[PDB]
């Protein structure tokens, strides 16, 4: 006998969340501003609620995954009555501020609130590859751990009592994803000028990525210690190599803004006295506010 | 175990030499600054009195200095002694730089391999080291076995084009900076909540590992020119990018990086990619900065 769960929001991610709960035996009530997106889910045994109220009331565990916290707040305020005493899990993407302003709203209405981040794509939801970071009501998490493991069986991980923490890790991890995707796509656009297929490039990209994890492990203690001994490569060397990517790009008639920018960053680090330091020393520039 | 010469004893130079030494090769080393050979000589390398005596000592000359301007200042005064020896240039280079050095070497009948070291010094000699060579097929085939001392698992020959090693290097370095910036800017973010980078890292690396899946899946999309959004649309990426931008501005940390990222999604969407996967960004990355 698997407990009931409600999923509010049936985007690409919403749909995957619901499906995961359904497959894991939970009686799954779904609702979306656009009901058409429940069609395939209802066929597989989900109940499409007539209203968000009837959706919220159906289950003691409400999962919401919509665009942003403006959409969350438009959705949860009209149903604050029916929410009260139910555990609301907000897996929508958010700033720390947004997560914490929603935490304070929920506490005032005695709604136990977990602020979550989905570190996975929809097809990964339900698999060992999915990592979900939750932070907020410790008791509420402890109570529903087993139900929530339907979307992240290997990595249903609770951080701290701070609701804003899930958001901070999410923001930091997404920045790494775009770092990689931009690096690989800009890299494929480079190799493209030599009629090299991205499918050919990829396995090498991924071998390099795997090896770059070593650098991350090794730069971490350097950031924490504030000591940046260059055992691998100096800012000078990084800086010079960055000139090559910038020039290579300009010259091949491809995108040059990304690498030019990267170079602007090394230039600054070196001007702040980091010439002989490892790439870990870039932490100091990344702490400094912009225009 | 054939003799090998390493010209350049920087952090990378020293590691290259050490690898050859440990692998039994009689290793002659030379550097503009001879002090950097000290530890290598103690382990059995011969410090040549001059670059000429260094080049002459072995039929295989490996050079790893700052840039191709430094290579050309070093190799031109010894073009005589080089002739008929295989010169392997593992210095970082543009495709143009690699190819202008290839044409200089051919005129002086010097067999020329242009290489890229896709590894850090401590990862030279291990299975983790990948080295990409491109140029003289015969010269590579002849010295494969000696060169496997620096990259035993991934001593990889590309094509006869000398500039190709440079293109793969440039593309792979772009990914390194992508990740390092992402992780360091990410640690600066988590830092505002007094979270240690050492704590963040294992999660960073779990996410990175999982992002490799996206790369293998976006590759065929870029090559086929079809960007079906099975994971997430440009719209969704675009919105999420707003969050990092705002979060950063607000926490008093660096905001240029994520703001820029967003500028890219905005453009992709304006070029009609709203409903396409992040693979569609290839089209923006092909377009010059104009
Ligand atoms: N791979 C991924 O896609 C991925 C990864 C992890 C995290 N996330 C996060 O998951 C969330 C949803 O992503 P997704 O793929 O489901 O996005 P999506 O496909 O764009 O879906 C957005 C969902 O939110 C609803 N919504 C949007 N604005 C609304 C409003 N003002 N009021 C009420 N409902 C509103 C939409 O309702 P309609 O159907 O009526 O438009 C839809 O159900 C985002 O915060 C995203 O950052 C996504
Ligand atoms: N180390 C890495 O992590 C790594 C990884 C892959 C590729 N690389 C490539 O390796 C090269 C340098 O690596 P590195 O880290 O060992 O560099 P480095 O520590 O900066 O050493 C640079 C080398 O170049 C020599 N040099 C510089 N200018 C010279 C000149 N005008 N005349 C003669 N020699 C000159 C230096 O000799 P002196 O000591 O006399 O100055 C030194 O041996 C770059 O092309 C870089 O892209 C580095």
Q: What secondary structure does DSSP assign to chain A, as a single string?
A: -PPPEEEE--SHHHHHHHHHHHHTT--EEEE-SSGGGGHHHHHTT-EE-SSHHHHHHT-SEEEE--S-HHHHHHHHGGGHHHHTTSEEEE-S---HHHHHHHHHHHHHTT--EEEEEEES-GGGTTSTT-EEEEEE-HHHHHHHHHHHTTT-TT-EEE--S-TTHHHHHHHHHHHHHHHHHHHHHHHHHHHHTTT--HHHHHHHHHHHHHHHHHHHHHHHHHHHHT--B-SS--HHHHHHHHHHHHHHHHHHTS--HHHHHHHHHHHHHIIIIITTB-GGGHHHHHHS---
Q: Which residues of A133-170 are buried (b: 16+ CB within 10 A; e: fewer)?
A: bbbbbeebbebbeebbbbbbeebbbbbeebbbbbbbbb
What is the Cβ-side half-sphere exposure of residue B226, based on CA atoms within 13 angstroms? 4
B80 Cβ partners below 8 Å, 6+ apart?
none
B29, B62, B64, best to mutate for ligand 2 pocket (most atoms within 8 Å of CB): B64
- Which ligand has its closest atom nearest to the C-alpha of B12? 2
Query: Which of B126, B159, B192 is where one domain is finished?
Result: B159
User: By what method was this entry solved?
Assistant: X-ray
A143 touches A87 (CB < 8 A)? yes
* Shared domain check, B168 and B280: yes
Ligand 2 pocket, residue B146 CB under 6 Å = no
Distance, CA of B198 to CA of B196 (rounded, Å): 5
* Shared domain check, B200 and B261: yes
- The DSSP-derived string for B152-164 is TT-EEE--S-TTH
- Number of other CB atoms surrounding residue A67 within 10 Å: 15
- Number of other CB atoms surrounding residue B107 within 10 Å: 9
User: How many domains, chain B?
Assistant: 2
A108 Cβ partners below 8 Å, 6+ apart?
none
Query: Which of B124, B144, B159 is where one domain is finished?
Result: B159
Q: Note whether A212 contacts B122, CB cutoff 8 Å.
A: no
Distance, CA of A205 to CA of B236 (rounded, Å): 25
* Shared domain check, A18 and A148: yes
Distance, CA of B186 to CA of B201 (rounded, Å): 10
Residue B134 DSSP label: E
Q: In terms of Cα–Cα distance, which of A2, A1, A9 is closest to A150?
A: A2
B156 Cβ partners below 8 Å, 6+ apart?
B130, B131, B132, B133
Q: Are strands B130-135 and B27-30 parallel, antiparallel or unpaired?
A: unpaired
- Which ligand has its closest atom nearest to the C-alpha of B76? 2
Residue B91 lies in domain: 1-159
What is the Cβ-side half-sphere exposure of residue A28, based on CA atoms within 13 angstroms? 30
Q: In terms of Cα–Cα distance, which of A5, A40, A52 is closest to A25?
A: A5
Ligand 2 pocket, residue B11 CB under 6 Å = yes
Distance, CA of A159 to CA of A136 (rounded, Å): 8
C-alpha B44: how far from chain center:
29
Largest CA distance in chain B: 65
Ligand 2 pocket, residue B128 CB under 6 Å = no
CA distance B289 to chain A (A): 6
Tokens of B51: 């670059």
Distance, CA of B59 to CA of B148 (rounded, Å): 16
Q: Which of A176, A187, A280 is nearest residue B204 as measured by Cβ atoms?
A: A176
Tokens of A40: 């395939």
- The DSSP-derived string for B212-241 is HHHHHHHHHHHHHT--B-SS--HHHHHHHH
Query: What element of type H or E holds B114?
Result: strand B112-118
* Shared domain check, B150 and B10: yes
Residue B273 DSSP label: I
**Residues with beta carbon inside 6 Å of ligand 1?**
A 9-14, 32-34, 37, 65-67, 71, 74-75, 92-93, 118, 121-122; B 231-232, 235-236, 240
CA distance readout (Å), A34 to A51, A65, A212, B29: 11, 14, 43, 71
* Shared domain check, A172 and A69: no
* Shared domain check, A141 and A56: yes
C-alpha A179: how far from chain center:
13
Is A247 among the annotated ligand-binding positions?
no
- Which ligand has its closest atom nearest to the C-alpha of B122? 2
Distance, CA of B145 to CA of B54 (rounded, Å): 21
CA distance A235 to chain B (A): 12
B122 Cβ partners below 8 Å, 6+ apart?
A231, A232, B15
Please calculate the CA angle B75-B81-B87 and round it to the nearest 5 degrees: 55
Residue B270 DSSP label: I
- The DSSP-derived string for B241-260 is HHHHHHHHHHHTS--HHHHH
* Shared domain check, A152 and A169: no
C-alpha B63: how far from chain center:
16
* Shared domain check, B154 and B202: no
Please provide residue B227's backbone torsions phi and psi, each rounded to the nearest 5 degrees: -125, 55
Q: In terms of Cα–Cα distance, which of B59, B52, B64 is closest to B17?
A: B64
Q: Which of A199, A211, A245 is nearest residue B128 as measured by Cβ atoms?
A: A211
Query: Which of B114, B142, B159 is where one domain is finished?
Result: B159
Distance, CA of A208 to CA of B168 (rounded, Å): 11
Q: Are strands A47-48 and A131-136 parallel, antiparallel or unpaired?
A: unpaired
Residue nearest to atom 27 of ligand 1 (CA): A67
What is the Cβ-side half-sphere exposure of residue A33, based on CA atoms within 13 angstroms? 11
- Pinpoint the alpha helices (H) of chain B: 11-22, 38-42, 51-56, 68-75, 79-82, 95-107, 137-147, 164-191, 197-224, 234-251, 256-268, 281-286
Strand partners, B46: B28
A113 touches A107 (CB < 8 A)? yes
B49 Cβ partners below 8 Å, 6+ apart?
none
Distance, CA of B171 to CA of B275 (rounded, Å): 27
* Shared domain check, B137 and B25: yes
How far apart are the two ends of chain B, measured CA to CA in Å? Answer: 53
Please provide residue B8's backbone torsions phi and psi, each rounded to the nearest 5 degrees: 105, 120
Q: Are strands A131-136 and A113-119 parallel, antiparallel or unpaired?
A: antiparallel
Residue nearest to atom 4 of ligand 1 (CA): A121
Q: Is A288 an 8 Å CB contact of chain B?
A: yes
Ligand 2 pocket, residue B123 CB under 6 Å = no
Q: Is B70 an 8 Å CB contact of chain A?
A: no
C-alpha B110: how far from chain center:
25
* Shared domain check, A37 and A122: yes
* Shared domain check, B131 and B179: no
Q: Which residues of B251-274 are buried (b: 16+ CB within 10 A; e: fewer)?
A: bebbbbbbbbbbebbeebbeeebb
CA distance readout (Å), A109 to A65, A70, A83, A102, A135: 21, 18, 9, 11, 19
* Shared domain check, A269 and A200: yes
A176 touches B206 (CB < 8 A)? no
In chain A, which residues have their Cβ closer than 8 Å to the Cβ of B160? none
């Amino acid at each position: 006998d698997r407990p009931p769960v409600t999923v509010v929001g049936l985007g690409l991610m919403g749909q995957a969340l619901a499906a995961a709960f359904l497959k894991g035996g939970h009686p799954t009530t779904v609702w979306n501003r656009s009901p058409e997106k429940a069609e395939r889910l209802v066929a597989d045994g989900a109940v499409l609620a007539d209203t968000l109220e009837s959706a919220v009331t159906a289950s003691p565990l409400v999962i919401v995954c919509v665009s942003d916290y403006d959409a969350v707040h438009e959705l949860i305020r009209p149903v604050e009555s029916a929410l009260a005493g139910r555990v609301l899990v907000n897996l929508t993407t958010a700033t720390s501020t947004q997560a914490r302003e929603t935490a304070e709203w929920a506490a005032q209405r005695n709604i136990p609130y977990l602020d979550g981040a989905i570190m996975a794509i929809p097809p990964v939801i339900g698999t060992d590859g999915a990592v979900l970071l939750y932070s907020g009501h410790k008791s509420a998490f402890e109570a529903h751990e087993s139900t929530l493991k339907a979307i992240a069986p290997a990595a249903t991980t609770y951080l701290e009592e701070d609701h804003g923490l899930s958001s901070l890790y999410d923001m930091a991890l997404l920045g790494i994803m775009w770092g990689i995707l931009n690096g690989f796509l800009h890299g494929a656009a480079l190799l493209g000028t030599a009629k090299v297929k991205a499918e050919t490039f990829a396995p090498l990209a991924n071998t390099m990525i795997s090896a770059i994890t070593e650098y991350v492990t090794a730069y971490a203690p350097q950031v924490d210690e504030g000591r940046y001994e260059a055992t691998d490569a100096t800012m000078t060397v990084h800086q010079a190599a960055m000139e090559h990517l910038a020039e290579e790009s300009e010259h091949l008639g491809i995108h040059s803004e990304l690498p030019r920018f990267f170079k602007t960053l090394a230039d600054r680090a070196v001007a702040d006295g980091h010439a002989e330091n490892s790439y870990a020393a870039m932490i100091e520039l990344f702490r400094k506010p912009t225009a």
